[PDB]
Amino acid sequence: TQSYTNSFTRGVYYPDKVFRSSVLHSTQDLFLPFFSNVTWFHAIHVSGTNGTKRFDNPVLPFNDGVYFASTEKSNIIRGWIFGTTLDSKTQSLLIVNNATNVVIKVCEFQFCNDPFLDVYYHKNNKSWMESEFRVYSSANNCTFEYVSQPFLMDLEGKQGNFKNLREFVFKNIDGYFKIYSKHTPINLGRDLPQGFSALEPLVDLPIGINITRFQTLLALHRSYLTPGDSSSGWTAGAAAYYVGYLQPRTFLLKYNENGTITDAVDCALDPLS
Amino acid sequence: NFNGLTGTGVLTESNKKFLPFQQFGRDIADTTDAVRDPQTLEILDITPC
Ligand SMILES: *[C@@H]1O[C@H](CO)[C@@H](O)[C@H](O)[C@H]1NC(C)=O
Ligand SMILES: *[C@@H]1O[C@H](CO)[C@@H](O)[C@H](O)[C@H]1NC(C)=O
Ligand SMILES: *[C@@H]1O[C@H](CO)[C@@H](O)[C@H](O)[C@H]1NC(C)=O
Ligand SMILES: *[C@@H]1O[C@H](CO)[C@@H](O)[C@H](O)[C@H]1NC(C)=O
Ligand SMILES: *[C@@H]1O[C@H](CO)[C@@H](O)[C@H](O)[C@H]1NC(C)=O
């Protein structure tokens, strides 16, 4: 799947820590332009009865930060890998997640063969996937094994038509790595529903390594409820796994009286704007 | 003096709903309005003499 879909009004985060109230403020920062297009990368059982390769986890350019969204009821999505090398020459970043914990490890990951996969790849019969994650082989010189409270907190889905939506923004500038996160329990029947919501800053990890590639780590043993097609370009379908690229834009934000961003307008989309 | 932020005035408790990540308070003309105590977790209004 390589379709294209419009991102209506998403991708705004608090520029700075200072509190403000009831002020219209203009800022110039990296942002996701309104009404831009985003691709749908997909995970599917490509002949899941056999160990047939799926190629659902490709490598992307990472041009000046990445926007990310995911709309699923399970914990299938867990972990990202970054780096310009992913080799033995230079370090690599791992943001793998535990059951109720996260560990961030910048270290030299020499060989990453492939995500682990159960040959049966059926979750309609067995629902347990236990301790089957080993991707890195040789851990050479490295430090900064940051540990804290888990990024994701499981918003339980029940009664149907009600699942959590996760939004993330990854930036790496001037030796500082910033991850803005937001959980929206309300998604209803739309994968990318209309509405305005800010992105909460969560962590600030000093590393300082230049990033030019990234890849996503899926629980590739099985991922159910997955349509797929061989189409490319401007098409239609479903992938439940998005991505977007930021640009150096200028925004105007309307802080509420309590101190929460309510509306925003970009100064480059429309003459009226 | 708070964390290296010199100032002068009167300090009084105020009902400012500061979010956990938000630390300083500010308004028009880059004027500091509230500060966060380096030891206790309290937010207080600052008013010039
Ligand atoms: C963005 O994607 C849309 C389809 O979603 C396409 O029509 C358009 O040409 C693409 N490029 C833009 C808007 O620059
Ligand atoms: C998380 O899992 C990794 C992988 O085995 C392990 O090294 C680490 O100690 C675990 N941490 C927690 C808090 O579970
Ligand atoms: C790590 O540093 C040690 C000491 O300089 C060196 O012997 C080793 O080859 C280094 N390994 C990598 C992968 O850079
Ligand atoms: C990022 O660092 C690597 C070193 O492994 C280097 O080869 C690459 O050119 C750097 N990226 C840029 C844009 O210079
Ligand atoms: C600001 O927060 C208070 C406390 O929850 C609430 O009573 C008030 O309605 C809020 N103001 C809004 C939503 O405009």
mmCIF file of C-alpha atoms and ligand atoms in Angstrom:
data_model
loop_
_atom_site.group_PDB
_atom_site.id
_atom_site.type_symbol
_atom_site.label_atom_id
_atom_site.label_comp_id
_atom_site.label_asym_id
_atom_site.label_seq_id
_atom_site.Cartn_x
_atom_site.Cartn_y
_atom_site.Cartn_z
ATOM 1 C CA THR A 1 0.000 0.000 0.000
ATOM 2 C CA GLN A 2 1.324 3.419 -1.061
ATOM 3 C CA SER A 3 -1.907 5.426 -1.093
ATOM 4 C CA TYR A 4 -2.237 9.112 -0.186
ATOM 5 C CA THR A 5 -4.625 10.634 2.345
ATOM 6 C CA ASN A 6 -5.315 14.174 3.535
ATOM 7 C CA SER A 7 -4.319 15.132 7.092
ATOM 8 C CA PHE A 8 -6.938 17.724 7.975
ATOM 9 C CA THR A 9 -5.872 19.664 11.096
ATOM 10 C CA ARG A 10 -3.368 17.507 12.983
ATOM 11 C CA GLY A 11 0.219 17.944 14.094
ATOM 12 C CA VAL A 12 0.540 20.857 16.532
ATOM 13 C CA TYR A 13 2.634 20.776 19.702
ATOM 14 C CA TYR A 14 3.536 23.225 22.448
ATOM 15 C CA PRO A 15 6.604 25.202 21.289
ATOM 16 C CA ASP A 16 7.891 26.045 24.771
ATOM 17 C CA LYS A 17 7.326 25.462 28.470
ATOM 18 C CA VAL A 18 6.229 28.985 29.432
ATOM 19 C CA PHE A 19 2.578 29.192 30.437
ATOM 20 C CA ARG A 20 0.307 31.613 28.579
ATOM 21 C CA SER A 21 -3.398 32.425 28.679
ATOM 22 C CA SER A 22 -5.852 34.030 26.243
ATOM 23 C CA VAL A 23 -3.159 35.366 23.902
ATOM 24 C CA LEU A 24 -2.925 34.954 20.130
ATOM 25 C CA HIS A 25 0.736 34.085 19.603
ATOM 26 C CA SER A 26 2.758 33.786 16.395
ATOM 27 C CA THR A 27 5.639 31.314 16.165
ATOM 28 C CA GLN A 28 8.001 30.024 13.475
ATOM 29 C CA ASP A 29 8.809 26.334 13.916
ATOM 30 C CA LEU A 30 8.853 22.936 12.267
ATOM 31 C CA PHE A 31 5.286 21.763 11.720
ATOM 32 C CA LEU A 32 3.123 19.513 9.583
ATOM 33 C CA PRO A 33 1.391 21.735 6.993
ATOM 34 C CA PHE A 34 -2.393 21.684 7.007
ATOM 35 C CA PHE A 35 -4.147 19.562 4.382
ATOM 36 C CA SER A 36 -0.946 17.755 3.424
ATOM 37 C CA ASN A 37 -0.869 14.182 2.165
ATOM 38 C CA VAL A 38 0.360 11.142 4.089
ATOM 39 C CA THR A 39 1.141 7.605 2.962
ATOM 40 C CA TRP A 40 -0.309 4.328 4.255
ATOM 41 C CA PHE A 41 2.322 1.711 5.012
ATOM 42 C CA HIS A 42 0.657 -1.576 5.868
ATOM 43 C CA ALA A 43 1.276 -4.860 7.667
ATOM 44 C CA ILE A 44 -0.498 -7.949 6.318
ATOM 45 C CA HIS A 45 -0.228 -11.745 6.387
ATOM 46 C CA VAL A 46 1.492 -12.242 3.040
ATOM 47 C CA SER A 47 0.776 -15.986 2.883
ATOM 48 C CA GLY A 48 0.923 -16.149 6.667
ATOM 49 C CA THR A 49 0.444 -19.919 6.737
ATOM 50 C CA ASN A 50 4.025 -20.087 5.431
ATOM 51 C CA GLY A 51 7.005 -17.991 6.440
ATOM 52 C CA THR A 52 6.648 -15.831 3.339
ATOM 53 C CA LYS A 53 8.325 -12.437 3.636
ATOM 54 C CA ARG A 54 5.998 -9.449 3.959
ATOM 55 C CA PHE A 55 8.370 -6.461 3.552
ATOM 56 C CA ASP A 56 6.008 -4.418 5.728
ATOM 57 C CA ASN A 57 8.889 -2.604 7.500
ATOM 58 C CA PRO A 58 10.876 -0.499 4.999
ATOM 59 C CA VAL A 59 13.428 2.294 5.528
ATOM 60 C CA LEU A 60 12.425 5.935 5.159
ATOM 61 C CA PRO A 61 14.481 9.099 4.527
ATOM 62 C CA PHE A 62 13.743 10.940 7.818
ATOM 63 C CA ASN A 63 13.912 14.448 6.365
ATOM 64 C CA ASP A 64 13.764 16.840 9.348
ATOM 65 C CA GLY A 65 11.654 14.957 11.854
ATOM 66 C CA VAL A 66 8.726 12.577 11.505
ATOM 67 C CA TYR A 67 5.024 12.665 12.335
ATOM 68 C CA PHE A 68 3.381 9.378 13.261
ATOM 69 C CA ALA A 69 -0.080 8.041 14.050
ATOM 70 C CA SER A 70 -1.493 4.619 14.842
ATOM 71 C CA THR A 71 -5.076 3.424 15.350
ATOM 72 C CA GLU A 72 -5.250 -0.130 16.695
ATOM 73 C CA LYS A 73 -6.817 -1.852 19.690
ATOM 74 C CA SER A 74 -3.921 -4.178 20.586
ATOM 75 C CA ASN A 75 -0.247 -3.640 21.478
ATOM 76 C CA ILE A 76 0.995 -4.800 18.066
ATOM 77 C CA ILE A 77 3.039 -1.654 17.429
ATOM 78 C CA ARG A 78 5.995 -1.531 19.828
ATOM 79 C CA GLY A 79 9.367 0.010 19.179
ATOM 80 C CA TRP A 80 11.288 2.026 16.597
ATOM 81 C CA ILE A 81 14.895 1.868 15.385
ATOM 82 C CA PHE A 82 16.786 4.906 14.121
ATOM 83 C CA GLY A 83 20.174 5.785 12.693
ATOM 84 C CA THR A 84 22.043 6.703 9.529
ATOM 85 C CA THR A 85 23.988 3.417 9.449
ATOM 86 C CA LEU A 86 22.256 0.520 11.248
ATOM 87 C CA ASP A 87 25.680 -1.112 10.915
ATOM 88 C CA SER A 88 28.748 -1.951 12.999
ATOM 89 C CA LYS A 89 30.456 1.361 12.188
ATOM 90 C CA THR A 90 28.162 3.790 14.023
ATOM 91 C CA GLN A 91 25.663 3.691 16.895
ATOM 92 C CA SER A 92 21.930 3.012 16.585
ATOM 93 C CA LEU A 93 18.896 3.992 18.663
ATOM 94 C CA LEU A 94 16.387 1.495 20.071
ATOM 95 C CA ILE A 95 13.091 2.541 21.666
ATOM 96 C CA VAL A 96 11.707 -0.950 22.288
ATOM 97 C CA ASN A 97 8.892 -1.223 24.841
ATOM 98 C CA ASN A 98 8.360 -3.776 27.607
ATOM 99 C CA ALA A 99 5.045 -4.947 29.073
ATOM 100 C CA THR A 100 4.670 -1.890 31.335
ATOM 101 C CA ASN A 101 8.060 -0.269 30.746
ATOM 102 C CA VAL A 102 10.235 1.266 28.039
ATOM 103 C CA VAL A 103 14.002 1.099 27.570
ATOM 104 C CA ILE A 104 15.911 3.430 25.241
ATOM 105 C CA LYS A 105 19.343 2.096 24.304
ATOM 106 C CA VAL A 106 21.787 3.905 22.035
ATOM 107 C CA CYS A 107 24.271 1.188 21.109
ATOM 108 C CA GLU A 108 25.991 -0.459 18.163
ATOM 109 C CA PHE A 109 23.532 -2.998 16.732
ATOM 110 C CA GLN A 110 25.637 -4.925 14.236
ATOM 111 C CA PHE A 111 23.184 -7.382 12.693
ATOM 112 C CA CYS A 112 19.404 -7.055 12.475
ATOM 113 C CA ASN A 113 18.314 -10.102 10.473
ATOM 114 C CA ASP A 114 14.515 -9.610 10.435
ATOM 115 C CA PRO A 115 11.565 -9.273 12.839
ATOM 116 C CA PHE A 116 10.585 -12.610 14.343
ATOM 117 C CA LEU A 117 7.653 -14.436 12.768
ATOM 118 C CA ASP A 118 5.589 -17.462 13.737
ATOM 119 C CA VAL A 119 5.220 -19.767 10.741
ATOM 120 C CA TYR A 120 1.531 -20.412 11.469
ATOM 121 C CA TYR A 121 0.855 -16.669 11.962
ATOM 122 C CA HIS A 122 -2.668 -17.333 13.248
ATOM 123 C CA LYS A 123 -4.136 -15.383 16.162
ATOM 124 C CA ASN A 124 -7.652 -16.766 15.637
ATOM 125 C CA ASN A 125 -6.623 -19.951 17.493
ATOM 126 C CA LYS A 126 -3.770 -18.986 19.852
ATOM 127 C CA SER A 127 -3.553 -15.512 21.388
ATOM 128 C CA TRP A 128 -0.231 -15.827 23.246
ATOM 129 C CA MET A 129 2.981 -14.387 21.765
ATOM 130 C CA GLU A 130 5.599 -14.896 24.482
ATOM 131 C CA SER A 131 9.269 -13.843 24.615
ATOM 132 C CA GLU A 132 10.229 -14.058 20.937
ATOM 133 C CA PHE A 133 12.134 -10.786 20.399
ATOM 134 C CA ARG A 134 15.897 -10.839 19.782
ATOM 135 C CA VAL A 135 17.159 -8.579 16.993
ATOM 136 C CA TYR A 136 20.612 -7.425 18.111
ATOM 137 C CA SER A 137 23.631 -9.723 18.359
ATOM 138 C CA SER A 138 26.816 -7.876 19.393
ATOM 139 C CA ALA A 139 26.653 -4.974 21.858
ATOM 140 C CA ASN A 140 29.955 -3.134 21.466
ATOM 141 C CA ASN A 141 30.937 0.120 23.201
ATOM 142 C CA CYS A 142 27.910 2.220 24.180
ATOM 143 C CA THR A 143 26.328 4.040 27.109
ATOM 144 C CA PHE A 144 23.148 6.058 27.853
ATOM 145 C CA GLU A 145 20.644 3.287 28.537
ATOM 146 C CA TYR A 146 17.854 5.619 29.585
ATOM 147 C CA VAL A 147 14.916 4.053 31.430
ATOM 148 C CA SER A 148 11.651 5.598 32.609
ATOM 149 C CA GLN A 149 7.891 5.098 32.740
ATOM 150 C CA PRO A 150 6.486 3.523 29.550
ATOM 151 C CA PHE A 151 5.540 5.903 26.757
ATOM 152 C CA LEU A 152 2.314 4.102 25.860
ATOM 153 C CA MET A 153 -0.430 3.511 28.411
ATOM 154 C CA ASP A 154 -3.029 0.986 27.286
ATOM 155 C CA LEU A 155 -6.378 2.681 26.790
ATOM 156 C CA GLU A 156 -8.710 -0.310 26.976
ATOM 157 C CA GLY A 157 -11.043 -0.779 24.013
ATOM 158 C CA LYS A 158 -14.528 -2.115 24.639
ATOM 159 C CA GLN A 159 -18.054 -2.282 23.189
ATOM 160 C CA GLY A 160 -16.731 -1.909 19.632
ATOM 161 C CA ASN A 161 -16.297 1.275 17.546
ATOM 162 C CA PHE A 162 -14.163 2.618 20.419
ATOM 163 C CA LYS A 163 -10.364 2.339 20.311
ATOM 164 C CA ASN A 164 -7.388 4.496 21.224
ATOM 165 C CA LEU A 165 -5.478 6.640 18.729
ATOM 166 C CA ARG A 166 -1.796 7.351 19.317
ATOM 167 C CA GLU A 167 -0.002 10.380 17.894
ATOM 168 C CA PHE A 168 3.744 10.981 18.046
ATOM 169 C CA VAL A 169 6.249 13.497 16.701
ATOM 170 C CA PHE A 170 9.981 12.756 16.638
ATOM 171 C CA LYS A 171 12.505 15.584 16.289
ATOM 172 C CA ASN A 172 16.301 15.557 16.587
ATOM 173 C CA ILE A 173 18.017 18.960 16.569
ATOM 174 C CA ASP A 174 21.168 20.465 18.129
ATOM 175 C CA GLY A 175 22.032 17.236 19.941
ATOM 176 C CA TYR A 176 18.587 17.013 21.566
ATOM 177 C CA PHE A 177 16.003 14.322 20.809
ATOM 178 C CA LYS A 178 12.380 15.237 21.530
ATOM 179 C CA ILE A 179 9.333 12.959 21.411
ATOM 180 C CA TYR A 180 5.900 14.569 21.649
ATOM 181 C CA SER A 181 3.052 12.171 22.351
ATOM 182 C CA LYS A 182 -0.716 12.211 22.672
ATOM 183 C CA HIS A 183 -3.427 9.626 23.356
ATOM 184 C CA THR A 184 -6.935 10.188 21.996
ATOM 185 C CA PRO A 185 -9.426 7.600 23.321
ATOM 186 C CA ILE A 186 -12.071 8.843 20.858
ATOM 187 C CA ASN A 187 -11.813 7.721 17.233
ATOM 188 C CA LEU A 188 -15.312 6.406 16.323
ATOM 189 C CA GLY A 189 -15.734 5.259 12.728
ATOM 190 C CA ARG A 190 -12.998 7.399 11.142
ATOM 191 C CA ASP A 191 -9.333 6.418 11.005
ATOM 192 C CA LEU A 192 -8.323 10.108 10.797
ATOM 193 C CA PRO A 193 -11.211 11.970 12.443
ATOM 194 C CA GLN A 194 -11.684 15.713 12.246
ATOM 195 C CA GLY A 195 -10.848 17.726 15.342
ATOM 196 C CA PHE A 196 -8.106 19.719 17.024
ATOM 197 C CA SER A 197 -5.808 18.377 19.742
ATOM 198 C CA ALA A 198 -2.370 19.422 20.971
ATOM 199 C CA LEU A 199 0.644 17.113 21.357
ATOM 200 C CA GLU A 200 2.076 16.840 24.856
ATOM 201 C CA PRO A 201 5.867 16.839 25.245
ATOM 202 C CA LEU A 202 6.882 13.693 27.109
ATOM 203 C CA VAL A 203 10.685 13.271 27.178
ATOM 204 C CA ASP A 204 13.889 15.066 26.152
ATOM 205 C CA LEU A 205 16.796 12.680 25.646
ATOM 206 C CA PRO A 206 20.284 14.094 24.972
ATOM 207 C CA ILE A 207 22.187 11.880 22.528
ATOM 208 C CA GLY A 208 23.547 13.988 19.683
ATOM 209 C CA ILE A 209 23.906 11.360 16.932
ATOM 210 C CA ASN A 210 22.833 12.382 13.443
ATOM 211 C CA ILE A 211 19.788 10.503 12.131
ATOM 212 C CA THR A 212 19.142 9.773 8.459
ATOM 213 C CA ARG A 213 17.225 6.459 8.485
ATOM 214 C CA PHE A 214 14.615 4.729 10.601
ATOM 215 C CA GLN A 215 12.659 1.482 10.613
ATOM 216 C CA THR A 216 9.673 0.200 12.565
ATOM 217 C CA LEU A 217 9.609 -2.935 14.722
ATOM 218 C CA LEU A 218 6.310 -4.826 14.464
ATOM 219 C CA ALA A 219 5.130 -8.010 16.172
ATOM 220 C CA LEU A 220 5.368 -9.732 12.804
ATOM 221 C CA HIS A 221 4.323 -13.155 14.124
ATOM 222 C CA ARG A 222 0.746 -12.133 13.351
ATOM 223 C CA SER A 223 -1.209 -8.941 12.697
ATOM 224 C CA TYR A 224 -4.895 -9.585 12.077
ATOM 225 C CA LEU A 225 -7.713 -7.515 10.544
ATOM 226 C CA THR A 226 -5.555 -6.551 7.582
ATOM 227 C CA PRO A 227 -6.725 -5.733 4.055
ATOM 228 C CA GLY A 228 -4.086 -5.342 1.375
ATOM 229 C CA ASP A 229 -3.587 -4.471 -2.271
ATOM 230 C CA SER A 230 -0.769 -4.134 -4.800
ATOM 231 C CA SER A 231 -1.782 -0.618 -5.883
ATOM 232 C CA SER A 232 0.540 2.381 -5.734
ATOM 233 C CA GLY A 233 0.281 6.144 -6.001
ATOM 234 C CA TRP A 234 -2.964 7.998 -5.244
ATOM 235 C CA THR A 235 -5.208 5.059 -4.335
ATOM 236 C CA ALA A 236 -7.641 3.976 -1.598
ATOM 237 C CA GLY A 237 -7.581 1.227 1.016
ATOM 238 C CA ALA A 238 -6.610 0.780 4.671
ATOM 239 C CA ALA A 239 -3.275 0.409 6.457
ATOM 240 C CA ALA A 240 -3.770 1.704 10.032
ATOM 241 C CA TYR A 241 -0.158 2.945 9.986
ATOM 242 C CA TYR A 242 0.630 6.482 8.806
ATOM 243 C CA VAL A 243 3.633 8.786 8.409
ATOM 244 C CA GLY A 244 4.261 12.455 7.611
ATOM 245 C CA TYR A 245 7.119 14.895 7.149
ATOM 246 C CA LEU A 246 7.563 18.289 8.807
ATOM 247 C CA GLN A 247 8.590 21.600 7.266
ATOM 248 C CA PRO A 248 9.813 24.958 8.625
ATOM 249 C CA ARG A 249 6.492 26.823 8.689
ATOM 250 C CA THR A 250 4.957 29.729 10.602
ATOM 251 C CA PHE A 251 1.868 29.243 12.755
ATOM 252 C CA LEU A 252 -0.540 31.352 14.786
ATOM 253 C CA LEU A 253 -1.916 29.737 17.943
ATOM 254 C CA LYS A 254 -4.887 30.640 20.147
ATOM 255 C CA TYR A 255 -4.186 29.754 23.770
ATOM 256 C CA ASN A 256 -7.278 29.237 25.897
ATOM 257 C CA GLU A 257 -7.901 30.964 29.216
ATOM 258 C CA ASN A 258 -6.856 27.797 31.053
ATOM 259 C CA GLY A 259 -3.691 27.480 28.966
ATOM 260 C CA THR A 260 -4.495 24.937 26.251
ATOM 261 C CA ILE A 261 -4.132 25.432 22.504
ATOM 262 C CA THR A 262 -7.538 25.498 20.819
ATOM 263 C CA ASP A 263 -7.107 26.749 17.236
ATOM 264 C CA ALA A 264 -4.198 27.372 14.891
ATOM 265 C CA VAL A 265 -3.709 28.834 11.422
ATOM 266 C CA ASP A 266 -0.764 28.481 9.047
ATOM 267 C CA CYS A 267 0.469 31.598 7.249
ATOM 268 C CA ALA A 268 1.275 29.833 3.968
ATOM 269 C CA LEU A 269 -1.832 27.874 2.898
ATOM 270 C CA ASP A 270 -4.409 30.434 1.756
ATOM 271 C CA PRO A 271 -4.448 34.185 1.050
ATOM 272 C CA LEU A 272 -7.227 34.469 3.634
ATOM 273 C CA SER A 273 -4.939 32.769 6.149
ATOM 274 C CA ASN B 1 15.829 34.700 43.671
ATOM 275 C CA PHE B 2 14.460 31.510 42.097
ATOM 276 C CA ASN B 3 16.854 29.157 40.267
ATOM 277 C CA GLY B 4 18.849 32.198 39.137
ATOM 278 C CA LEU B 5 15.913 34.489 38.310
ATOM 279 C CA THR B 6 16.363 37.747 40.211
ATOM 280 C CA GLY B 7 13.341 39.920 40.906
ATOM 281 C CA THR B 8 11.532 42.146 43.370
ATOM 282 C CA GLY B 9 7.892 42.320 44.393
ATOM 283 C CA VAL B 10 5.104 40.688 46.359
ATOM 284 C CA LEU B 11 4.354 36.957 46.285
ATOM 285 C CA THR B 12 0.855 35.571 46.772
ATOM 286 C CA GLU B 13 -0.781 32.200 46.198
ATOM 287 C CA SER B 14 -2.953 32.123 43.078
ATOM 288 C CA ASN B 15 -5.277 29.629 41.395
ATOM 289 C CA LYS B 16 -3.093 29.048 38.343
ATOM 290 C CA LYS B 17 -3.687 25.636 36.755
ATOM 291 C CA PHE B 18 -0.080 25.071 35.758
ATOM 292 C CA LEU B 19 0.410 21.819 33.883
ATOM 293 C CA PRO B 20 3.215 19.536 35.116
ATOM 294 C CA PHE B 21 5.588 20.312 32.244
ATOM 295 C CA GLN B 22 4.805 24.039 32.301
ATOM 296 C CA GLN B 23 7.150 25.845 34.684
ATOM 297 C CA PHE B 24 7.124 29.633 34.186
ATOM 298 C CA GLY B 25 4.275 32.079 33.779
ATOM 299 C CA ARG B 26 4.412 34.898 31.266
ATOM 300 C CA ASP B 27 2.213 37.564 29.690
ATOM 301 C CA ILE B 28 2.510 40.503 27.293
ATOM 302 C CA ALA B 29 5.933 42.192 27.004
ATOM 303 C CA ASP B 30 7.967 39.215 28.294
ATOM 304 C CA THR B 31 7.067 39.923 31.927
ATOM 305 C CA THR B 32 7.375 37.065 34.407
ATOM 306 C CA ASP B 33 4.146 36.454 36.315
ATOM 307 C CA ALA B 34 4.501 33.151 38.207
ATOM 308 C CA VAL B 35 7.427 30.956 39.230
ATOM 309 C CA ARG B 36 7.821 27.350 40.364
ATOM 310 C CA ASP B 37 9.588 26.718 43.657
ATOM 311 C CA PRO B 38 12.838 24.731 43.248
ATOM 312 C CA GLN B 39 12.002 22.594 46.312
ATOM 313 C CA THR B 40 8.227 22.418 46.782
ATOM 314 C CA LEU B 41 5.696 22.012 43.980
ATOM 315 C CA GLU B 42 3.817 25.287 44.316
ATOM 316 C CA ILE B 43 2.884 28.013 41.827
ATOM 317 C CA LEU B 44 2.463 31.571 43.088
ATOM 318 C CA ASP B 45 1.585 34.915 41.524
ATOM 319 C CA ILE B 46 4.207 37.679 41.519
ATOM 320 C CA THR B 47 3.103 41.315 41.500
ATOM 321 C CA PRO B 48 5.336 44.406 41.301
ATOM 322 C CA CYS B 49 5.570 46.632 44.352
HETATM 323 C C1 LIG C 1 -0.777 14.826 -2.119
HETATM 324 O O1 LIG C 1 -1.644 13.690 -2.177
HETATM 325 C C2 LIG C 1 -2.866 13.962 -2.878
HETATM 326 C C3 LIG C 1 -3.741 12.740 -2.718
HETATM 327 O O2 LIG C 1 -3.914 12.413 -1.346
HETATM 328 C C4 LIG C 1 -2.567 14.301 -4.337
HETATM 329 O O3 LIG C 1 -3.783 14.613 -5.005
HETATM 330 C C5 LIG C 1 -1.611 15.485 -4.422
HETATM 331 O O4 LIG C 1 -1.204 15.682 -5.771
HETATM 332 C C6 LIG C 1 -0.377 15.240 -3.546
HETATM 333 N N1 LIG C 1 0.567 16.357 -3.597
HETATM 334 C C7 LIG C 1 0.405 17.626 -3.163
HETATM 335 C C8 LIG C 1 -0.916 17.995 -2.536
HETATM 336 O O5 LIG C 1 1.304 18.453 -3.279
HETATM 337 C C1 LIG C 2 12.763 -4.859 29.222
HETATM 338 O O1 LIG C 2 13.119 -5.901 28.310
HETATM 339 C C2 LIG C 2 14.524 -5.950 28.015
HETATM 340 C C3 LIG C 2 14.713 -7.052 26.997
HETATM 341 O O2 LIG C 2 14.974 -8.299 27.629
HETATM 342 C C4 LIG C 2 15.327 -6.177 29.293
HETATM 343 O O3 LIG C 2 16.715 -6.101 28.987
HETATM 344 C C5 LIG C 2 14.975 -5.132 30.342
HETATM 345 O O4 LIG C 2 15.626 -5.435 31.571
HETATM 346 C C6 LIG C 2 13.467 -5.084 30.555
HETATM 347 N N1 LIG C 2 13.117 -4.055 31.520
HETATM 348 C C7 LIG C 2 11.971 -4.052 32.208
HETATM 349 C C8 LIG C 2 11.781 -2.915 33.163
HETATM 350 O O5 LIG C 2 11.120 -4.925 32.059
HETATM 351 C C1 LIG C 3 34.190 0.601 20.897
HETATM 352 O O1 LIG C 3 35.305 1.240 21.529
HETATM 353 C C2 LIG C 3 36.417 0.371 21.792
HETATM 354 C C3 LIG C 3 37.466 1.212 22.479
HETATM 355 O O2 LIG C 3 37.853 2.317 21.673
HETATM 356 C C4 LIG C 3 36.920 -0.258 20.493
HETATM 357 O O3 LIG C 3 37.947 -1.198 20.790
HETATM 358 C C5 LIG C 3 35.781 -0.950 19.760
HETATM 359 O O4 LIG C 3 36.234 -1.429 18.498
HETATM 360 C C6 LIG C 3 34.626 0.021 19.557
HETATM 361 N N1 LIG C 3 33.520 -0.626 18.871
HETATM 362 C C7 LIG C 3 32.720 0.020 18.016
HETATM 363 C C8 LIG C 3 31.631 -0.793 17.389
HETATM 364 O O5 LIG C 3 32.871 1.211 17.759
HETATM 365 C C1 LIG C 4 25.380 11.184 9.402
HETATM 366 O O1 LIG C 4 26.488 10.501 9.999
HETATM 367 C C2 LIG C 4 27.068 9.499 9.147
HETATM 368 C C3 LIG C 4 28.158 8.824 9.948
HETATM 369 O O2 LIG C 4 27.899 7.437 10.115
HETATM 370 C C4 LIG C 4 27.579 10.132 7.854
HETATM 371 O O3 LIG C 4 28.041 9.104 6.986
HETATM 372 C C5 LIG C 4 26.473 10.926 7.171
HETATM 373 O O4 LIG C 4 26.998 11.633 6.052
HETATM 374 C C6 LIG C 4 25.848 11.914 8.147
HETATM 375 N N1 LIG C 4 24.757 12.638 7.519
HETATM 376 C C7 LIG C 4 24.922 13.816 6.911
HETATM 377 C C8 LIG C 4 23.691 14.427 6.313
HETATM 378 O O5 LIG C 4 26.017 14.366 6.845
HETATM 379 C C1 LIG C 5 -10.829 25.589 32.803
HETATM 380 O O1 LIG C 5 -10.650 24.529 33.742
HETATM 381 C C2 LIG C 5 -11.628 24.519 34.792
HETATM 382 C C3 LIG C 5 -11.254 23.389 35.722
HETATM 383 O O2 LIG C 5 -11.546 22.126 35.139
HETATM 384 C C4 LIG C 5 -13.032 24.368 34.208
HETATM 385 O O3 LIG C 5 -13.989 24.476 35.255
HETATM 386 C C5 LIG C 5 -13.294 25.436 33.154
HETATM 387 O O4 LIG C 5 -14.541 25.197 32.514
HETATM 388 C C6 LIG C 5 -12.179 25.436 32.116
HETATM 389 N N1 LIG C 5 -12.391 26.488 31.135
HETATM 390 C C7 LIG C 5 -12.786 26.250 29.879
HETATM 391 C C8 LIG C 5 -13.011 24.810 29.520
HETATM 392 O O5 LIG C 5 -12.957 27.155 29.070
#
